[PDB]
Design a protein around this nucleic acid. Structure first.
Lengths: 168, 152, 145, 257
RNA sequence: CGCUGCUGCAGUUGAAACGCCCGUAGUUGGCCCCCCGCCGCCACGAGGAAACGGGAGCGCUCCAGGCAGGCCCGUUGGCCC
RNA sequence: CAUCCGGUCGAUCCUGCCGGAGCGCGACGCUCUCCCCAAGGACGAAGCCAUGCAUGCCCGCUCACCCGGGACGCGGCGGACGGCUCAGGACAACGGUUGCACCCCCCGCGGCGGUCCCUGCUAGCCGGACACCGCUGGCAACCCGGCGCCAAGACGUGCGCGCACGGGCGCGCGCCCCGCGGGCGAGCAGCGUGACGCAGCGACGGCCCGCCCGGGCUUCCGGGGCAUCACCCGGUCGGCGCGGUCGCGGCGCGCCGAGGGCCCGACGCCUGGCGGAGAAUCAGGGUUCGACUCCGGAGAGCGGGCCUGCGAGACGGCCCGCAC
């Protein structure tokens, strides 16, 4: 019965609004499919939900891995995907390991370790590439699109975010 | 840089990684001149404000009716109340009754706004519950020019 | 809908039971007469292995049939009792040379419509690219001015 | 409100079809297609009522059930298939050819045309779309879907045979132009001016042949020949007969009656 | 029924000036600058269904009707709301 | 389309209302010679219902039948349109006016039409898997069981060109701004570039695109009474990060502030409140009424909740709580 209909909301004047209609199908809402990071992969089940007009949406509910891109060198590769670090809206969601765009995550450096040989390719991603995990944030809507692609964090977002989570 | 702000903000239209180097093909902000003869403000061109809801430097696009009204309230952050004075004609008695309609407008930091000033609003996809209008120009007045019910 | 539980109980008025492995001492009624199977396979693939042609596999066998032969049993409507209309399943999954021609017709048509499009794009590509350079031939004059 | 409506009441029906108020609870409803609902007329009425060929609505469906009627050079048989502006409709059993035109009052009129006139069709160019994998495309007033030096509002002379661009009537001041919508439908005049206003609803000013500057919306403007009508004009030349000039015609008609 | 009063009602005595005064909203504000800018205002367009009200044309035998009819505006069914 | 007369006194002139006088539209009494036209269980009971009917149409397969006469089931389309009634709903609905650069849309119409595979292929083009129907059976009824068998333009699989390609990506214009397009009033598009996915449709090519017909919302102005209702609201008001949706949005969630409304009447309450197109009465101005024809809403005893579908939060669908 979830709905985004405005009828159930009060007015600007804080006034109750008469309910002129029963909930309608067009204004319907569906359960948030919380994409869940698998963590160790040793399953990606992605659902497909019928929409309005017989369209389709892919709902990620559990998945690991996914395409990532190093914007500074403009090289793009699939990555294993490690634990979510930071959620910017909740500290519980990070520990739960739910995936949603804007949630910063660690990634394995092994696919992108090929740039350690190269030199002066920034300095921050050089130290993450040397390290097991790379700081990266998600750029895809895991629940609506069904994929969780992301961009490796580079420059200022990485600077502010590192300070936000890593130091104790 | 702060310790109190929970989430980092940038422009989706700009690239944060780009800012690290190449001091040639470098742009500070993805601002575009608005149509309907709207000049992009200079404060907006040289402006370090993220403003996703900025008409000039943000995803917001101005399409629809464009109105002109006074500034009634500005207590909200990045939002002002535009009082729209107007006249209603009665036919049973041939006189006009004065009316007032308050409208909510998202204001960019490029606009510095004080009460009693007159703002030129424009239509926007609803930004919030009460905000379907964005400011495209702000005109100040000396001190408080009284009120005088002006249907601008 | 109300349903009885799968585990059986004495309560059920009736049940149903099917031989999995047949015993000796064949029953007078349960095991003896094989009810004549009817509804002869119509599938061509089924017909190929059913009529001793599986080895032929892809083949123009065309017509092999086992059919009921007791007239048609609806000859009373024809009003002629002494007739023997064939009682046969129409072949299913049949392949004809018109079917082959139909595949070739549509494959020629798909290729033809695709080919016409490919050549046309190159012609329009010239129109636009040449037009931008042709505009340059005009822009020469203001510089002369 | 549930799903799409599939009925059109007689009072709901547009005035141009001129379907009698009584005798019928509901008029026929057009199908989604080349022309719009109030921008097109039904094919059944054009034969059943306008020409009186079909005694009943059903016996109009019978006539095209077996192919016997064509729109824009294509069989286009469906009874309520929309037949709209500048349509080449030809009855080959009657051996007659008729462009569907707008009368000065504004109603649709079937006007007989030559085989050369049947050879070409006029349709306005809607805004160019950039879809279909980057191949440039543009739609018509008949929805049919190119030449690079063309803009919106201009009329393409699609042959219906080649199914390709032929003579493109560019939208510029002074072209002899027809009015598709508004009160002065059917009137023909050169476009005196255009005021865009850089917002929406560009103003249209039209000098007629007799010096009366009629006006309409810029969307409702149809080009009819870059120079010269380039079509079979019904014998009114969009002169706008006045209500008294119409009473003269009617009274002489009654005299002849 | 101008006995609801915008047009257009009454309050000395038939019903009815607050006992008096300050006063915020409200409403109302002498003249005065010609020459533009926003107002309001007024005219003119454009665009947005009919039925309906009006109205052209018409003998339903007359009519209330109807958009018919007639040896025909490209027969009509305009045009206004 | 501008009209009065009767009624306070012994008479008089006033104010003042009473009563007549005309019309409409319902009851009600008495009567009606026809012909034509015609409303019709709205009116404090959206109360309850016996009975019969109100959505079917075709074969895509036909092995029965029996000459394509062709049932029976599956298959496709329609059953959301149509009919009904105003219960609810008072910045709502409804109307004019706008916007979707914030979107969804079957049929139809006019077009595009390279579909990777490792492979695995039967691609001269494939599978298994069931209704129907037999064969035995239950049940008081309703309703269905098991067996055995066979079909489909049903469904499942499947070759198929690296401008393969649905999606979602990361990266690709700028120098105070303002003037060319594939563009527009406006950085919108459509791609190139580097990845991912392997979406469709393909066993009788449609993937897909536009037009359009509707929606989904949205802008602006209009949008009942009551002060014996003067103070209201607390997702309420802004911002931020997500989700969720066809999509924008407090639309849901966290987070962060402190708003948003009001004597130009807010909020609260009430309404024998559907709204307009219109209707009645009438010099002019007003007044009065909007059940029903047209349109838009909203509902199908009452609340909820749902799948199917291109579209219904459907009730001549289903499911549950509450009545009866």
């Amino acid at each position: 019965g979830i709905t985004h209909d405005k009828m159930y909301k009060r007015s600007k004047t804080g006034a109750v609004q008469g309910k002129w209609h029963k909930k309608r199908k067009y204004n319907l809402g569906r359960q948030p499919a919380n994409t869940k990071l698998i963590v160790k992969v040793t399953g990606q089940k992605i659902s497909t939900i019928r929409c309005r007009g017989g369209n389709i949406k892919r709902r990620a509910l559990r998945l690991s891995h996914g395409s990532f891109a190093w914007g500074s060198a403009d090289i793009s590769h699939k990555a294993r995907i490690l634990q979510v670090v930071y959620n910017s809206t909740s500290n519980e969601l990070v520990r739960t390991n739910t995936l949603v765009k804007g949630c910063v995550v660690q990634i394995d450096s092994a696919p992108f370790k090929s740039a350690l040989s190269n030199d002066t390719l920034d300095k921050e991603i050089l130290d993450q590439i040397r390290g097991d995990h790379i700081l990266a944030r998600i750029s895809s809507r895991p629940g609506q699109v069904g994929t969780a692609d992301g961009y490796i964090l580079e420059g200022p977002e990485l600077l502010f975010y590192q300070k936000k989570l890593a130091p104790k | 840089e702060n310790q109190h702000e929970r989430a980092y903000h940038k422009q989706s239209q700009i690239f944060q990684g780009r800012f690290l180097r190449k001091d040639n093909a470098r742009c500070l902000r993805f601002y575009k001149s608005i149509g309907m003869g709207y000049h992009t403000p200079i404060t907006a061109i040289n402006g370090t404000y993220i403003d996703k809801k900025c008409p000039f430097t943000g995803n917001v696009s101005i399409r629809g009716r464009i109105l002109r009204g006074v500034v009634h309230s500005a207590k909200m952050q990045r939002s002002i109340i535009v009082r729209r004075d107007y006249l209603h004609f009665v036919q049973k008695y041939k006189r006009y009754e004065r009316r007032h309609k308050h409208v909510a407008a998202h204001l960019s930091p490029c606009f510095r706004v004080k009460e009693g000033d007159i703002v030129t609003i424009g239509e926007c996809r609803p930004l919030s519950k009460t905000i379907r209008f964005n400011v495209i120009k702000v005109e100040p007045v000396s001190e408080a020019a009284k009120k005088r019910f002006s249907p601008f | 809908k109300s349903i009885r539980g799968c585990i059986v109980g004495p309560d059920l008025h009736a049940l149903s039971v099917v031989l999995v492995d047949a015993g000796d001492k064949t029953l007078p009624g349960l095991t003896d007469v094989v009810v004549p199977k009817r509804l002869v396979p119509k599938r061509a693939s089924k017909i190929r292995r059913l009529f001793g042609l599986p080895t032929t596999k892809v083949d123009p066998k065309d017509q092999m049939l086992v059919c009921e032969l007791i007239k048609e049993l609806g000859h009373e409507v024809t009003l002629k009792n002494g007739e023997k209309k064939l009682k046969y399943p129409k072949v299913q999954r049949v392949v004809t040379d018109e079917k082959y021609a139909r595949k070739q017709r549509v494959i020629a048509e798909k290729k033809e419509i695709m080919r016409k499009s490919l050549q046309q794009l190159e012609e329009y590509k010239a129109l636009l690219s040449r037009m931008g350079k042709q505009h340059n031939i005009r822009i020469y004059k203001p510089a002369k001015r | 409100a549930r799903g799409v409506r599939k009925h059109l009441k007689r009072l709901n029906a547009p005035k141009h079809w001129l379907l009698d108020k009584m005798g019928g609870i509901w008029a026929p409803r057009p199908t989604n297609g080349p022309h719009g609902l109030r921008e097109c007329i039904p094919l059944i009425l054009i034969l059943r009522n306008r020409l009186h060929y079909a005694n009943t609505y059903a016996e109009t469906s019978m006539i095209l059930q077996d192919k016997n009627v064509l729109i824009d050079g294509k069989p286009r048989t469906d009874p309520t298939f929309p037949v709209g502006f500048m349509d080449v409709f030809e009855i080959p059993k009657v051996h007659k050819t008729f462009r569907v035109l707008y009368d000065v009052k504004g109603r649709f009129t079937l006007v007989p045309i030559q085989s050369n006139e049947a050879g070409f069709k006029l349709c306005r160019v809607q805004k160019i779309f950039l879809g279909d994998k980057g191949m440039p495309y543009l739609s018509t007033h008949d929805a049919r879907t190119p030449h690079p030096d063309i803009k919106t509002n201009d009329t393409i002379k699609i042959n219906l045979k080649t199914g390709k661009i032929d003579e493109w009537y560019k939208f510029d001041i002074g072209k002899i132009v027809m009015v598709t919508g508004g009160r002065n439908c059917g009137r023909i005049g050169t476009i005196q001016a255009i005021d865009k206003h850089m917002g929406s609803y560009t103003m249209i000013r039209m000098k007629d042949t007799e010096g009366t500057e009629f006006l309409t919306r810029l969307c409702n403007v149809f080009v009819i020949g870059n120079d010269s009508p380039a079509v079979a004009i019904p014998t009114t030349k969009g002169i706008r007969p006045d209500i008294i000039k119409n009473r003269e015609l009617r009274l002489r008609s009654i005299a002849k009656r």
